Amino acid sequence: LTVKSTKQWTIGTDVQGSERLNGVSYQEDALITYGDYQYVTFYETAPAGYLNHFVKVGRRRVSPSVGDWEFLTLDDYTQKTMDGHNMISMGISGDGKIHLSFDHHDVPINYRISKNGIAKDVPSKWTSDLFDPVVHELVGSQGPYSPLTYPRFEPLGNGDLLLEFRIGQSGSGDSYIHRYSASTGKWQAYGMYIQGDDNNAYINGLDYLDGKLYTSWTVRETPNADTNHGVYFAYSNDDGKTWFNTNDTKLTKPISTSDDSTLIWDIPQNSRMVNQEGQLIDTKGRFHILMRDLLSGEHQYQHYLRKADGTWTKNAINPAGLNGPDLYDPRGKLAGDASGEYLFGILPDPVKQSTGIYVATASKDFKDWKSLAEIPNTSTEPLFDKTRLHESGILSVFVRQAGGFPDRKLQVWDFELDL
Ligand SMILES: *[C@@H]1O[C@H](CO)[C@@H](O[C@@H]2O[C@H](CO)[C@@H](O[C@@H]3O[C@H](CO)[C@@H](O)[C@H](O[C@H]4O[C@H](CO)[C@@H](O)[C@H](O)[C@@H]4O)[C@@H]3O)[C@H](O)[C@H]2NC(C)=O)[C@H](O)[C@H]1NC(C)=O
Ligand SMILES: C[C@@H]1O[C@@H](O)[C@H](O)[C@H](O)[C@H]1O
Ligand code: NA
């Protein structure tokens, strides 16, 4: 496997402040291909300047030829909170509507939707008036909508879309799922699906494939990030309503963080393992988790693999040149190609201030990690486009540069793979 071509685009100037608002690990998602177009969302500085931002949404054509990015500015909602939690997630439903949820740290939901199915019936003109106002509920569904952190979208197989988030706080919180029907345009509540017990679960993402929804998490006791413990897993065969552990044992609804039956790896507190890193269902149905810890004696990225024979394995990702991250360093992701043979570790390096793209193969039990490419000059939690990789064999990555405002840009890097 080799890179046929490498291209980059600067899509905006990052915002100024002591927190990272763009390129955050739990954006789900920031960069999405739907039909023939790719979409991206990020904050840019509003005319009021420092500590005033607007959400932007970019689009470009990617099939059958790649066209130029164009952007709209949502200049009716000013993001003002310098808190690295307050990121943006986007989702696109099978009616073509684009959904955005953003700007939360233990506050009520902030959500909006396109008026029409602009990703299906693609308008000529790309402007802000394609979006409805910001609302603080999900029409058709019910609360609680506060205190909300971590909106995550997952597109389902019938065009529907899940929206998942935590209600409560670090060290004491629960998570919920809501489902948007593409056929009716109404949301419905799936309710609480994981319940804390004077702690909170921190999921790594949502992964849906062929009618099954997968997630993994750690449990956090207190607002101190050293108090994470365990690596957990569950899946659902009904889009979030009911859940099973790794042994196909049905769980209680909601899943309790006290139920050890979802534990797949014992990781104590003070292991230097961070919440909300990376997960992946590959296209052959093997589940993968990216975490980190110091348990070997050195800080290293860790790959957890749920094998087909049922067994979990854990292997350090330690290819030559990769500096291992500590608790607070940027978080990575895992991506997969259409075949399921290739696993990509998209791993920010805290020494180099760059993002390494490493590849392992299913034939080698993913032990063969190798440096494939690098995105230089990043201070970001890199985020990729799942669909674009599956459909075209292009690994497309959204990144915040390193460096100082206003030199520090937002970019999309495309690695055309020789698949
Ligand atoms: C429900 O699922 C859980 C989670 O997967 C599962 O618990 C796991 O069971 C495995 C298999 O027993 C445990 O793995 C072993 O851990 C012990 C530590 O006491 C070691 O002895 C084992 O190492 C030997 O066996 C390995 C087999 O591959 C060899 O590679 C190794 O070199 C040794 O010979 C092995 O690692 C694992 O600890 C648990 N995990 C947890 C989190 O509890 C449980 O069994 C499932 N229950 C049912 C009813 O299916
Ligand atoms: C460790 C800490 O954990 C949560 O508060 C969020 O994931 C935040 O982004 C991360 O920095
Ligand atoms: Na607690």
Side-chain angles (χ1 to χ4, degrees), residues 228-302:
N228 291 326
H229 57 95
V231 182
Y232 299 80
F233 170 90
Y235 78 88
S236 171
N237 297 312
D238 64 6
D239 307 319
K241 289 196 282 301
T242 69
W243 293 80
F244 297 82
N245 73 4
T246 192
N247 304 320
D248 312 311
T249 310
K250 191 164 190 212
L251 302 173
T252 63
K253 193 298 211 198
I255 304 165
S256 174
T257 55
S258 287
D259 173 3
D260 66 26
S261 84
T262 51
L263 186 72
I264 64 75
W265 218 267
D266 201 35
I267 301 291
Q269 296 183 42
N270 302 295
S271 302
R272 303 305 287 194
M273 180 172 65
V274 72
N275 44 282
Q276 306 160 292
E277 183 133 34
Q279 64 168 56
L280 173 70
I281 198 69
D282 71 27
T283 61
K284 299 298 208 188
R286 313 175 204 92
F287 189 72
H288 305 263
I289 314 172
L290 184 67
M291 308 289 275
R292 66 195 51 182
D293 62 60
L294 175 59
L295 293 174
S296 77
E298 305 170 289
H299 297 284
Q300 302 173 294
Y301 284 108
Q302 304 290 344

Side-chain angles (χ1 to χ4, degrees), residues 26 85 150 202 220 225 274-276 328 331:
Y26 39 80
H85 297 81
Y150 312 116
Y202 275 119
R220 177 80 85 74
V274 72
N275 44 282
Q276 306 160 292
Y328 298 104
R331 289 164 292 199

Side-chain angles (χ1 to χ4, degrees), residues 218-230:
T218 191
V219 170
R220 177 80 85 74
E221 293 306 312
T222 80
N224 179 339
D226 278 314
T227 72
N228 291 326
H229 57 95

